[PDB]
Design a protein around this nucleic acid. Structure first.
Lengths: 58, 49, 52, 148, 222, 185
RNA sequence: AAAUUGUUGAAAGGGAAGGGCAUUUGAUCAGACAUGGUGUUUUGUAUU
RNA sequence: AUACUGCCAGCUGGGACUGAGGACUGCGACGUAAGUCAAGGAUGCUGGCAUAAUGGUUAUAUGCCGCCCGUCUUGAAACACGGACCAAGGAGUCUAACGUCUAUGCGAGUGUUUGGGUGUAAAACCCAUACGCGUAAUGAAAGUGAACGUAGGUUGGGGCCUCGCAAGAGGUGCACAAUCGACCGAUCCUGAUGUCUUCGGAUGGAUUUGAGUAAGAGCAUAGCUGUUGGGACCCGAAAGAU
RNA sequence: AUAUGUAAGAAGUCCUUGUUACUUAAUUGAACGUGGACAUUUGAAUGAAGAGCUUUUAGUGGGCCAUUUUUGGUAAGCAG
C-alpha cells in the first residue's frame, strides 16, 4: 500500500493566498548580536548625548 | 488527545463518580430543619440559653 | 425632577400631605439587566428531574 | 440555551460538522495526555516547555501556614491607614502625633518600599521589613519597629 | 433667503462662463488635431518631393481589450492583466506607450487585442461608455461638472479635455486614465472576422497587436 | 465572470452599533453619531468609535493617569475625556481641579474628583458643554497589560507566560526550560 | 393517518414510470366595474 | 473620375425588446427678451369583455432535455455498499475544571446564598467573619524583593491647543508599536567601615538569565465556540474477570 | 532563454563633530544626535478593490488529470 511521497503542488498558491508580503521594517533596529564593546560604547555615548542635550535645552 | 495552547488540566474523573455524586438539593430543607431543631431545643430548655 | 407625590385616602380624593420621591424611582431603567436577572432567578426557583 | 447551539444548525447536514473523510471517531489520538513524549511531543515542546522532568528538592509535610507572608507596599500602607483620619494626619504631618500602622493587624507579614510615600512621619509595625522600605520610611521621617 | 433669484442668477452666470470657456477649449483642440493631421500629410509629401522618407512617429497611445475569459491563465499574465485593469472578457483600457507598458503588452499578448486608436474611436468610447472612478464607485461621466469636480486640479474640465489628454497623452494622462473606469465593451456586432480568436492577428487569429485595425474592432465592439 | 482581486462581500472589519443592549449607551451613540455627522469634529468621530468599542478594548483609566495627563504641559485646564470607567487610585495623595467626563465613575473616583473640587460629567454633558470637543484631552487605559495578552503569542524563544493553572516548582520548570534538563526553550 | 385494498368516476398506455423548461386542450378556481365621482326626469331622493 | 481606406458632433428608411422612477429643484437647447422643448426613466388617442376572456392550479399531449438516492472514494448511474413499503421512536447531551471573545455589575478590589436572620416555608429579602482569585516577583532553596531622572531618552503616533478669504507650521502628545536605558529576583564577579578570630555583604560590574517593576485590572455571573476526564454523537467486536 | 537577489530616497542628501569608558599617532574614525538648506515631477512604470496588526477555532493532512521539463521501465489508462 504505497502512497505519494512528496510534492510541491498547490504550495505556492497556498503561500500567495495571504503570503509573501514583505516583513515590516523599523527605525532603530535591535542592537542584539552586535559587538558588545560597541554596545557599551554606544550606551555611554547615548547617556552623554542625553545629558548634553538637556544641558543645551535646560 | 492534546491540542492547541491550553492549560494542562487534572480532572480526577476516572472512577465511578456518577455513583459517588452528592447534590445538595436539601440545602433549604436542612436549614429549615436546623432552625426547627434549635427552636425545639430552646423550648425544651426554655429558661436556659 | 419630580417635586412631590400625593397620598390617596380612602375617605376622599386625596389629603393635604405629600412626600418626595426616594430616588429609587429615579434610578435608571435597564431592561437588559432586569431580563438577565429575572431569567436567572426564575431558574433559581426550580426542581430537579431525572430518568431512572 | 440548547436552542443556540450549532447542533441545531447542523440538523440536515450529514456529518454534523465533523467532516466526511476524517470522521468524528472516539479517540484517534489517545486519551488524556497520551503520547505527550511520542506523538504530542510537538505540542508539548511548543506550548508547555518544562512539562517533563523534576528539578527542585522535595519538602515532606509542607505548610502554607508556615509560608504565610503577604506583602504590602508603602503606598498601600498609607491607604491602609483610615481615610477620614488620613486627611488629618496628611495635613498635620508632625512628630509626637505620627499614626501607628499595624501591618500585621491589617494582615500583611512584610512591607516593601515600592516608592514615594509623603513626608508625613508615621510609625510602622511589621513582622518583616525591606531595606528600601525602611530607608524610605525614615526619609519620610517615621520609623519601623519590629513585632511578632 | 429666497434662493430663487440671486443664487440662481449667480449659478447660471457661472455655468454660462464655464460653457464659453469649454467651447473655446474645444475649438482649440479641434484646430490642433486638424493642424497635426495636415502637418503629417505635408511632411510626408515634402519628404517624397525631396527624395527622402518620412518615418511616422511611433504611436504614444494604445487601446488594449482583454478578449480571453478568466479561466486557465498563468500567474504572471494574470497579474499583468490585473495591473492593466483587464479583469473581464471584452474589457478595455488606454495605455501610454513606454518600454514598461510595451513589455507588459508583450507579456499579455495571447489574451488581449491591442492597437493604436484614433481620435474618432477615443471620442466614441468616452462619449458612449464614460464612467468615472469616484469614491471607488463607477458613476457615469454624463457631465462636465462631474469631470471638472473630480479632475479640476489638472485643468480637465470636460469630456473634451479628458479626451484631449487621452489622445495627446500629456502630463496628467496617468490621472485621467485612472479616473476613467475600465471600458466594458460588448462582443463585436459583425463578429470577430476570424474563425478562431486565439491565434495572433498576423496568423489569421484575433489577439496581439492589430495596429490600426483596433479602431474598427473597438467601434464594432462599442 | 470577473477575475476578482479582493474578497467579495467582505465586511468592514470594524465595530458599529455596539453589542451592548444598554438603551442609554444607544442614546449616547445616537447623539454622538449625529455630532460626528453634522460637526466634522475628529474628536466626535473618535468618541463615537470609542463608544462602539468593547470592554477589554475600554480598559479602566485611573485618577493617577488623569493626574499625569493634567501634569502634561499646558493641559491643566483641559477637560479629561475617557470613554469607559474611571477608577480610584490609592497611590496618589494629591489631585488637581480638573473636569472629568466619563461613561462610568467608581465611588472612590467620583469622591476624589468632587473632593479635589472638579466635576464628574457624562458624555452628554460633555457634548452640551463642548460640541466640537474644545479644550478636551482623551485618555486611554493600558489594553496590553492583562492576563490574556500576556499569554498571547506563546511559543519558543518568545517568553509569553505559558497557559498554566498551578504555579511553582515542578510545574513546567524542567526539560525544555533549563540546560541541565535537556534544552532551554 | 399512512402503507396496502374494493368500488362513484376522470384522463394515459407500440420493450417502464416519474421530472424540468414552454405552450395547447379538458377540468377547476381566486382576484376585479354597488369602487369616496355626475345635486336633482326614472327609484328602495332621518337611508344618499 | 473610379476597386480601397479613414472621418462626418452627414442625410433618410424598415424592425425588435424595454417604460424602471419623486411634495419646487439639476445640466442644457430653441427667433434681439413673453416661454416652449426629444433637457435628472411613457405619455396621448381609440377600441373589445363589465367575463374563466387574461391568468393561477391541475391531468394529458407535444418539442428538447432529464441515469437512483445516501456513502466511501482521485473517480458511482454503476456489474461497489444500504434501501420492498408505511406509521411512530431514533443519534454532538449533562457534569467537573478550563482557553479566546462578548454582555452585565462592582472595581484594587471582587464573590450574600458553607452557614446565620427572617420569611407569603425549596422562591424572595437581609447578614459583623473567614476563604478563593487579584494587588509582587524571582530562585531548587535558604532568602531577597521593584522611581538616582517631570516613573527616563529616541522614533512613529489618534486627539486637543494660533497667525489663518488662493499654495501654508509649531506645542502637547497619555492606546500601541520599535529601540536604548533605570529598578526587583537568579547566575558569575569585585569586595569598605565593623569583627560572638571566617561573619551581613556597602559599593561598583557583567555579549548571562525571569511567566517581573516602570500611576494597578481584576473578581463574579451569563452566552456562542473550543479542550480534557467521564457511557461522552448513536449502534457494533474476537475477547477478559467475578 | 526562462526563473532569481537587491536598489530606485524624507528612517533621504549636504556644513556644526556635541557625547563616548569603542577606535586612532592625533578632535583621527565609528555609532547616535542638536542646530540649518531641499514642494504639487519627495527623485522610474502600472495598479492599489482601504494599509497594517492581534486573538481564536473548523475541516484537511488517500489525491488525481492536461501542456511543457524529466526519472525507472520495451511499454502501460504504469511508478516517481
Amino acid at each position: 500500500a504505497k502512497s505519494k511521497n512528496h510534492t510541491a503542488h498547490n504550495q505556492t498558491r497556498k503561500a500567495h493566498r495571504n503570503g509573501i508580503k514583505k516583513p515590516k521594517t523599523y527605525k532603530y533596529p535591535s542592537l542584539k548580536g552586535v559587538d558588545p564593546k560597541f554596545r557599551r560604547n554606544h550606551k555611554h555615548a547615548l547617556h552623554g548625548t542625553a545629558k548634553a542635550l538637556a544641558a543645551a535645552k535646560k | 488527545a492534546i491540542s492547541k495552547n491550553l492549560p494542562i488540566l487534572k480532572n480526577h474523573f476516572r472512577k465511578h463518580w456518577q455513583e459517588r455524586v452528592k447534590v445538595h438539593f436539601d440545602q433549604a430543607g436542612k436549614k429549615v430543619s436546623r432552625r426547627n431543631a434549635r427552636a425545639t431545643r430552646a423550648a425544651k430548655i426554655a429558661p436556659r440559653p | 425632577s419630580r417635586p412631590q407625590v400625593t397620598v390617596h385616602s380612602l375617605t376622599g380624593e386625596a389629603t393635604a400631605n405629600a412626600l418626595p420621591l426616594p430616588a429609587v424611582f429615579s434610578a435608571p431603567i435597564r431592561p437588559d439587566i432586569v431580563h438577565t436577572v429575572f431569567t436567572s432567578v426564575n431558574k433559581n426557583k426550580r426542581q430537579a428531574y431525572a430518568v431512572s | 440555551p440548547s436552542r443556540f447551539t450549532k447542533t441545531r444548525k447542523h440538523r440536515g447536514h450529514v456529518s454534523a460538522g465533523k467532516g466526511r473523510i476524517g470522521k468524528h471517531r472516539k479517540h484517534p489520538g489517545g486519551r488524556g495526555m497520551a503520547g505527550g513524549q511520542h506523538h504530542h511531543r510537538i505540542n508539548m515542546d511548543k506550548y508547555h516547555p518544562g512539562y517533563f522532568g523534576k528539578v527542585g528538592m522535595r519538602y515532606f509535610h509542607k505548610q502554607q501556614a508556615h509560608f504565610w507572608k503577604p506583602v504590602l507596599n508603602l503606598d498601600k500602607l498609607w491607604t491602609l491607614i483610615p481615610e477620614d483620619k488620613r486627611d488629618q494626619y496628611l495635613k498635620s504631618a508632625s512628630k509626637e502625633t505620627a499614626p501607628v500602622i499595624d501591618t500585621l493587624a491589617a494582615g500583611y507579614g512584610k512591607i516593601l518600599g515600592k516608592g514615594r510615600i509623603p513626608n508625613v512621619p508615621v510609625i510602622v509595625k511589621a513582622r518583616f521589613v525591606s531595606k528600601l522600605a525602611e530607608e524610605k520610611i525614615r526619609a519620610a521621617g517615621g520609623v519601623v519597629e519590629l513585632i511578632a | 433667503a429666497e434662493q430663487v433669484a440671486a443664487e440662481r442668477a449667480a449659478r447660471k452666470a457661472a455655468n454660462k462662463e464655464k460653457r464659453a470657456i469649454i467651447l473655446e477649449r474645444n475649438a482649440a483642440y479641434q484646430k490642433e488635431y486638424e493642424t497635426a493631421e495636415r502637418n503629417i500629410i505635408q511632411a510626408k509629401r515634402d519628404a517624397k518631393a525631396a527624395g527622402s522618407y518620412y518615418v511616422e512617429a511611433q504611436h504614444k497611445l494604445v487601446f488594449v481589450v482583454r478578449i480571453k475569459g478568466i479561466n486557465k491563465i498563468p500567474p504572471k499574465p494574470r497579474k499583468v492583466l490585473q495591473l492593466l485593469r483587464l479583469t473581464r472578457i471584452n474589457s478595455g483600457t488606454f495605455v501610454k506607450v513606454t518600454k514598461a507598458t510595451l513589455e507588459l503588452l508583450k507579456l499579455i499578448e495571447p489574451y488581449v487585442a491591442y492597437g493604436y486608436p484614433s481620435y474618432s474611436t477615443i471620442r466614441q468610447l468616452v462619449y458612449k461608455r464614460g464612467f468615472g472612478k469616484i469614491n471607488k464607485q463607477r458613476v457615469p461621466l454624463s457631465d462636465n461638472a462631474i469631470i471638472e469636480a473630480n479632475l479640476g486640479k489638472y485643468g480637465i474640465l470636460s469630456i473634451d479635455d479628458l479626451i484631449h489628454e487621452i489622445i495627446t497623452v500629456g502630463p496628467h494622462f496617468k490621472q485621467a486614465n485612472n479616473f476613467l473606469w475600465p471600458f466594458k465593451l460588448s462582443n463585436p456586432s459583425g463578429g470577430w472576422g476570424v474563425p478562431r480568436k486565439f491565434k495572433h492577428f498576423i496568423q489569421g487569429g484575433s489577439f496581439g497587436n492589430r495596429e490600426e485595425f483596433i479602431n474598427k474592432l473597438v467601434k464594432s465592439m462599442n | 465572470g470577473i477575475d476578482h482581486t479582493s474578497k467579495q462581500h467582505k465586511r468592514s472589519g470594524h465595530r458599529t452599533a455596539p453589542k451592548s443592549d444598554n438603551v442609554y449607551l444607544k442614546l449616547l451613540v445616537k447623539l454622538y453619531t449625529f455630532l460626528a455627522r453634522r460637526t466634522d469634529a475628529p474628536f466626535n468621530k473618535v468618541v463615537l468609535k470609542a463608544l462602539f468599542l468593547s470592554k477589554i478594548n475600554r480598559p479602566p483609566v485611573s485618577v493617577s493617569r488623569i493626574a499625569r495627563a493634567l501634569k502634561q504641559e499646558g493641559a491643566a485646564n483641559k477637560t479629561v475625556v475617557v470613554v469607559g470607567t474611571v477608577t480610584d487610585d490609592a497611590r496618589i495623595f494629591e489631585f488637581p481641579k480638573t473636569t472629568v467626563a466619563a461613561l462610568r465613575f467608581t465611588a472612590g473616583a467620583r469622591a476624589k474628583i468632587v473632593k479635589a473640587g472638579g466635576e464628574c460629567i457624562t458624555l452628554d454633558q460633555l457634548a452640551v458643554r463642548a460640541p466640537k470637543g474644545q479644550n478636551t484631552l482623551i485618555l486611554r487605559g493600558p489594553r496590553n497589560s492583562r492576563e490574556a495578552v500576556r499569554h498571547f503569542g506563546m511559543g519558543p524563544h518568545k517568553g509569553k507566560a505559558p497557559r498554566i493553572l498551578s504555579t511553582g516548582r515542578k510545574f513546567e520548570r524542567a526539560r525544555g526550560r533549563r540546560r541541565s534538563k535537556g534544552f532551554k526553550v
